[PDB]
Each structure stands twice: as structure tokens, then as C-alpha cells.
Design an enzyme around this catalytic site. Sequence first.
Site, mmCIF file in Angstrom:
data_model
loop_
_atom_site.group_PDB
_atom_site.id
_atom_site.type_symbol
_atom_site.label_atom_id
_atom_site.label_comp_id
_atom_site.label_asym_id
_atom_site.label_seq_id
_atom_site.Cartn_x
_atom_site.Cartn_y
_atom_site.Cartn_z
ATOM 1 N N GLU A 1 -9.083 -5.422 -3.483
ATOM 2 C CA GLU A 1 -8.462 -4.283 -2.837
ATOM 3 C C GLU A 1 -9.441 -3.314 -2.189
ATOM 4 O OE1 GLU A 1 -5.270 -3.700 -2.505
ATOM 5 O OE2 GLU A 1 -4.290 -5.067 -3.899
ATOM 6 N N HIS B 1 -7.556 -6.094 0.868
ATOM 7 C CA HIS B 1 -6.375 -5.235 0.778
ATOM 8 C C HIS B 1 -5.529 -5.577 1.946
ATOM 9 C CE1 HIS B 1 -3.899 -1.709 0.247
ATOM 10 N NE2 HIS B 1 -4.186 -1.320 1.474
ATOM 11 N N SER C 1 0.834 -1.204 0.000
ATOM 12 C CA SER C 1 0.000 0.000 0.000
ATOM 13 C C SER C 1 0.879 1.270 0.000
ATOM 14 C CB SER C 1 -0.952 -0.015 1.210
ATOM 15 O OG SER C 1 -2.172 0.633 0.914
#
Length: 524
Positions: free
Chosen positions: A322, A433, A195
Site C-alpha cells: 500500500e 495501492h 481508498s
Amino acid sequence: IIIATKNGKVRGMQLTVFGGTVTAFLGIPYAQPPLGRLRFKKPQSLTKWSDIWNATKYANSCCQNIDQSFPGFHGSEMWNPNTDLSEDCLYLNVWIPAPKPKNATVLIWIYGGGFQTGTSSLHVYDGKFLARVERVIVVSMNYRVGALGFLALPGNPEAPGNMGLFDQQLALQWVQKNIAAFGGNPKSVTLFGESAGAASVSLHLLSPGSHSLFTRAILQSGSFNAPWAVTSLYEARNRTLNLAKLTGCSRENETEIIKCLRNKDPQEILLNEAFVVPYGTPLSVNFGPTVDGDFLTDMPDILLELGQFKKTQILVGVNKDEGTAFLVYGAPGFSKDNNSIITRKEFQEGLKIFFPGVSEFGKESILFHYTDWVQRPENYREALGDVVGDYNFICPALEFTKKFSEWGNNAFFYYFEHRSSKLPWPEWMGVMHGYEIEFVFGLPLERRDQYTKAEEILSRSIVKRWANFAKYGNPQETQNASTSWPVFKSTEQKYLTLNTESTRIMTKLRAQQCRFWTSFFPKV
Ligand SMILES: *[C@@H]1O[C@H](CO[C@@H]2O[C@@H](C)[C@@H](O)[C@@H](O)[C@@H]2O)[C@@H](O[C@@H]2O[C@H](CO)[C@@H](O)[C@H](O)[C@H]2NC(C)=O)[C@H](O)[C@H]1NC(C)=O
Ligand SMILES: *[C@@H]1O[C@H](CO[C@@H]2O[C@@H](C)[C@@H](O)[C@@H](O)[C@@H]2O)[C@@H](O[C@@H]2O[C@H](CO)[C@@H](O)[C@H](O)[C@H]2NC(C)=O)[C@H](O)[C@H]1NC(C)=O
Ligand SMILES: *[C@@H]1O[C@H](CO)[C@@H](O)[C@H](O)[C@H]1NC(C)=O
Ligand SMILES: *[C@@H]1O[C@H](CO)[C@@H](O)[C@H](O)[C@H]1NC(C)=O
Ligand SMILES: *[C@@H]1O[C@H](CO)[C@@H](O)[C@H](O)[C@H]1NC(C)=O
Ligand SMILES: [Cl-]
Ligand SMILES: [Cl-]
Ligand SMILES: [Cl-]
Ligand SMILES: [Hg+2]
Ligand SMILES: [Hg+2]
Ligand SMILES: [Hg+2]
Ligand SMILES: [Hg+2]
């Protein structure tokens, strides 16, 4: 187990992993505590020390606000810091295999957390398994997040911006000057992050100062070209000044607006941080990377377009779902507690949430492009997830990967579509995610921790792949007759899917959706 570094000696600690040992030097300091006059300033070099420093436990995490949305819920609390929050948090960890390696490849992890949160001591970042299994030296560092790590007043050394990124950089510099002592090859360093960590990594590829500090890079769910990765020059100044206002630090001499800020309390800055934005989103990064003119010399989008970035191989990828993770943090009709079957009006309100400063037409476009069913109940729930996913991660990741290949280097793109059997979040959230991180760190290799057997084969395979990519720049798994991982070329765009099931080579991931996000949307 005491190793002599350029700034002093440090005493590690042995660990027991899979019938063997791994040495761990948790919490080595790598910069001068960014306190008092140093708050908001680039990390200052460290003062050499004497008498064996004891790095036998994770140091403090950096100051950051915390996810209080689901108290007691593991799904989210597993991301919350697990060491005292302090401005004194510029420490790093080292996991050297045992016995001492001769010339081992180094993997430096840069945690994610929206540039607002995160810490290297998370259980899912424990680099002892990778150390044990591939005999690689893993490294974690805590870097300042939030306004304390990314507050910006362009051109002003009192608060220039990207302090977080310079912290990271300082840590890499540390691995350059010291990893040799631990038995590491400073000429074979691979940065990997997820991320905002992957977005950080991608920025180290653009930052001239990190050029010699690493060899290769791995970007898991994130790249600098992500809608959220970079804060504009405007958004930064407005927000920095607004933080001033909230703390009553409004002065007309910027340099003073800053000194009034160094006197506030670490907490009072964390408290007002959340409001510098009028109407943020579940993905708002109040204070992040900016074009300071130091770490970043020009808008990163241009540097990328024109090929101004470290030439090397990259391993880039994304998880199948995600977006979902964010839908429960403000999307009407959503709950980690039910099937969150939302209607069209709810989807429409959903968009208002993520695309807040977007025109009415722009939102109709998203809707239109994503509501072309193939009339089914969980249509809009899933449509909202992909919208957020595709828009914030998947597409940007693909565009970055693509543009980067255009300059000659081998790129490998993966698509993680495996939902953890241990996943604490509901089924509807799918392959969430951040949830490939545990497979990447070999947690499933440990046969206690209730992970299926198949998940072990996968984590083992991914770990091999990641290691081979770090060592040799080719993410293959050459022994157990597995599917080959083709290079990602700008025209065929092949990616490898990572699943417990049958791994496959496919092409042009999210072709139709990303054309909308990468070509059209930027226009509304
Ligand atoms: C740029 O900042 C101004 C000021 O922000 C306000 O004060 C900050 C300290 C913080 O508390 C913000 O949440 C406040 O909004 C923004 O202007 C405000 O905009 C909102 C909504 O448009 C409005 O309710 C306020 O009255 C406005 N305040 C003033 C006096 O202008 C402005 O929106 C910010 N720019 C951006 C990011 O859009
Ligand atoms: C799924 O749950 C959401 C959220 O509900 C939460 O959990 C339940 C136990 C609920 O009873 C509340 O305590 C919690 O808010 C439901 O959405 C809410 O729906 C009500 C009535 O329709 C509405 O007043 C609230 O505004 C909604 N909350 C928000 C803002 O999302 C949703 O209806 C449930 N979906 C189903 C039926 O599975
Ligand atoms: C470091 O650890 C050793 C071994 O437990 C201990 O003897 C020593 O006092 C420690 N150093 C200090 C005081 O932090
Ligand atoms: C590690 O490998 C490099 C080449 O990548 C070499 O220059 C260096 O001497 C090696 N380190 C050792 C084993 O001392
Ligand atoms: C290959 O298979 C063996 C068992 O047959 C397993 O122990 C090993 O980890 C596998 N290789 C990898 C890295 O996938
Ligand atoms: Cl907590
Ligand atoms: Cl309508
Ligand atoms: Cl396979
Ligand atoms: Hg966990
Ligand atoms: Hg699976
Ligand atoms: Hg296929
Ligand atoms: Hg279109």
C-alpha cells in the site's frame, strides 16, 4: 433500449463483452448541477425531465487538481480524469446485463482519490465485465471532491461539509428509487470502493441516512479510521478560513466568506486548495469528511467503538504494498526510475515527510520499531514503504474490520499480494495501492489486454468472490475447488490471501506492526 426512471426516460447503449451484450447507461444525472448558489451546498433533488435523455457517454468529471508528477507516464495518468472537469458532474452510470435481469444484485462503486480527485469514468472502473460475467448491475457516480465537495463551516448549510458524501448518498437513494426499472433489486445493493472510496463506504455504515440505502459493503484499501480519512473540526475551520484568505475572501461573517467563495472561479478554488495546509504530505487530504452533525453525528472513532453502525457483513482488505506508491511523491532518494535504495538518513528524512507534525521521539519510535533487520541494502527502502502502508491503510483496515466484527457480523478480510504483470511502476513498488482494482473489475478476463493466464484465473475468482459476497453475503468460490474464505473473528483474525499462486488462510496480519500503530502511536 430506453428505461423510464422516476425523473424521465433514458436511452442506453449496447456493448459487446465476451460474446454477449451488456447495456450501459453512462452519464445519467442524479442531482441538480451544484452550480452558482448551489456550490458548496448539499446536492439538491433533480427536476423531472421529458424527452428521452441520452446516457450513451460518461459525463463530466468533477473539478479537481491533477497529478502532473509524471506526465506521459501511464502509471499515474491512468488515474487522471478522462472527461471534461466541470462543476456539473453529479452523474452516475448503470451497467445492466443483457438480456434484462429479473432481480439482480447491485454493486455500487465509490471511487477513491483522497477525497480530492477521482472519477467514475476511469478505465479501471468500467463495470461492464462484472455485468457480463456475474449478471449483476454495477453503478458508478461522480461525487464532488476537494473543497467543492468537502469544504466545511460546521452548522452552516451554505458549506456544511461532506457534500461529497451526500452526493454519494443521493446517488444511492437514486438506485433505491430507480434500479428496479433496470431490473435491479434495491434490497440487494452492495457498496464497494477503494481508498477514499472504501473510507466513504465505511462512513455509509455509520451514517444514519445511508442505513436503508444499501445491504452490504466492500472496503478495498481504506476505512474511516484511517489517519487521513477524517478531517477534525479544527483542521477544517482553519483550512476553510485559509482558503478564504488565499482567495481574498476573508470576511467576519462566515456566511459571507462563503458567498465570496461562490463567486470565485472553479479553477481559482482548485488552485488555492493545495495550500490550506502548512506542510501537507503525499497523503494529505486537504478537504475531506468531517463531523458535520448531519451525515456524521459524532466522531466516527467513537461510533465504531460503541457499535453504532449498520449491522451487516463486510468484506475488507488491503494490498501487500500500500505504501510504496507514495514514496515517489516527496520521499528523498525515491524515484520510479531507479531502485530507490535509500540510506538511514534518507529514511529519517522520509519520516519527516509523512509524519510532519509528529514529535522527534515519535519518529524515533517508528524508526526503532521498523529498523530491526534480519545487513541488507533495500532494508530502509522497504521499511519506509511498510511504515506508510501499515500506518495509513493496513492497520486501520484491520482495526476497523476487528471492531466491526465485535458486534456480531461476519467480516472477511483479504490480503492482495499479486503484482500486475502489466504494472507500469517499478518492481520495487511491488503490489501497489490501487492495483487490485483491475482484478476486481475483471479487466484481466479480457484476453486481449496482455494479462497473464494465471491473472485471468485470479480475476475470475475474485470477481466470483465479490459477486457471491454481494449476492449472498459470503465471498466464497464454491465450484472450482478453491480455498474456503473463513470469517474474520476478533480473536483468531483469519484473512485470505489473494495471489495467482497458492491462496492461503493466515492469521493476525502485521500483528507486531499494527500494535504499534493502533495502540502506541496514537499516544505520541
Ligand atoms: C492554521 O492556519 C494558519 C494560517 O496559515 C497560513 O495562511 C494560509 C492562508 C496558508 O497560506 C498557510 O499555508 C499559511 O501557513 C497557520 O499558521 C501559519 O503557520 C505557518 C507555519 O507554522 C507560518 O509560516 C505562518 O506564518 C502562520 N500564519 C499565521 C499568521 O498564523 C497554522 O499553522 C494553521 N494551523 C495548522 C494546520 O497547523
Ligand atoms: C534515484 O533517483 C533519485 C532522483 O533522481 C532523479 O532521476 C535521476 C535521473 C537524477 O539524476 C535526477 O535527474 C532526478 O532527480 C536520486 O536522488 C537524487 O540524488 C541527487 C544526487 O545524489 C540529489 O542531488 C537529489 O536531491 C536527489 N533527488 C531527490 C530529492 O530524491 C537517487 O540518488 C537515485 N538513486 C539511485 C542511485 O539509484
Ligand atoms: C439520442 O441518440 C439518438 C440515437 O443516436 C439520436 O437520434 C437523438 O437525436 C439523440 N438525442 C439527442 C438530440 O441528444
Ligand atoms: C427481488 O427480491 C426481493 C427479496 O429480496 C423481493 O421482495 C422482490 O419482489 C424481488 N423483485 C422482483 C423479482 O420483482
Ligand atoms: C472454473 O474453471 C473453468 C474452466 O475449467 C473456468 O471457465 C471458470 O471460470 C472457473 N470458475 C471460476 C469462476 O473460477
Ligand atoms: Cl492530464
Ligand atoms: Cl541515528
Ligand atoms: Cl485456491
Ligand atoms: Hg492501466
Ligand atoms: Hg503473483
Ligand atoms: Hg501461512
Ligand atoms: Hg512497541
